[PDB]
Write a protein that binds this ligand. Structure first.
Ligand SMILES: COc1cccc(OC)c1C(=O)N[C@@H]1C(=O)N2[C@@H]1SC(C)(C)[C@@H]2C(=O)O
Ligand SMILES: COc1cccc(OC)c1C(=O)N[C@@H]1C(=O)N2[C@@H]1SC(C)(C)[C@@H]2C(=O)O
Lengths: 137, 139
């Protein structure tokens, strides 16, 4: 009712903590920070402007500016305006999938693939609506 | 390869949840004169009390990039040290207003679902959260 909201928050806080730790080394091997990493996973999904990234995150523009220019200098991202993933950046996102997929299956090897289907359909509709309300405001 | 698709969506889904909250709490954060990251701190202290390390490694961010956020809130009088770190009154009102916003939207975004549907959804996310936590413990 309202603790679904709390749960959701606690669930998201947990996933972030698991991801930070599991991707700890990779990020070090790349010289990329956690701050930057999220931008890379965020761009895996879309080609965004530093503003788009800044609003889709609520943090200080300067901070997003600093991290994007670091990703360019690292050739982990590139230009059109558009800030999209470069191929070296893409391999990180693939080295990231591989590690996520490995632990994810571990924890879901016993689920009913169909139970999950209905659960996913519910989330796609909520997601669909989340994107809808979000446009500006 | 089947899980990869679910993982992508989960990441997208969480991606949007974060995005939405950011747009939805901006004006309230501005009203209280705080940054979003400063809000997370208050939010993380709404569920239970914490110290610096606890938080600094909870979402593993920089060294002196947690400390600064911490003392700022003491000065804003939204948090209290009674290291130790817990929420204050003006901070409790913040979370109040915050939850009110998150509950209207989430409700009216869920209200047409069959409670049984929502409950099933949560039961699945609860078991994943459960398995996540235990994994974290093993590092
Ligand atoms: C637009 O952002 C900036 C503007 C002006 C000066 C800046 O630092 C000199 C930066 C910046 O991003 N500094 C980053 C920081 O912190 N850094 C990096 S560079 C570093 C000093 C080697 C150290 C690290 O990465 O190890
Ligand atoms: C999980 O949020 C993040 C995830 C990953 C990196 C992040 O940047 C450090 C943040 C973040 O700072 N988020 C902002 C913050 O703090 N937040 C907002 S969204 C919120 C979590 C509901 C809470 C609030 O405003 O109530």
């Amino acid at each position: 009712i309202e603790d679904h909201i709390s749960f959701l928050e606690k669930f998201i806080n947990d996933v972030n903590t698991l991801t930070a730790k599991l991707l700890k080394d990779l990020q070090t091997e790349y010289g990329i920070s956690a701050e930057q990493s999220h931008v890379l996973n965020m761009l895996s999904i879309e080609a965004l402007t530093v503003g788009q990234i800044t609003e889709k995150q609520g943090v200080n523009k300067a901070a997003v500016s600093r991290r994007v220019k670091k990703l360019l200098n690292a050739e982990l991202v590139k230009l059109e305006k558009i800030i999209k993933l470069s191929n070296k950046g893409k391999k990180y996102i693939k080295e990231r999938k591989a590690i996520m997929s490995h632990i994810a299956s571990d924890m879901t090897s016993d689920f009913d693939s169909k139970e999950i289907e209905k659960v996913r359909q519910v989330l796609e509709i909520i997601d669909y609506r989340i994107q809808s309300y979000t446009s500006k405001l």
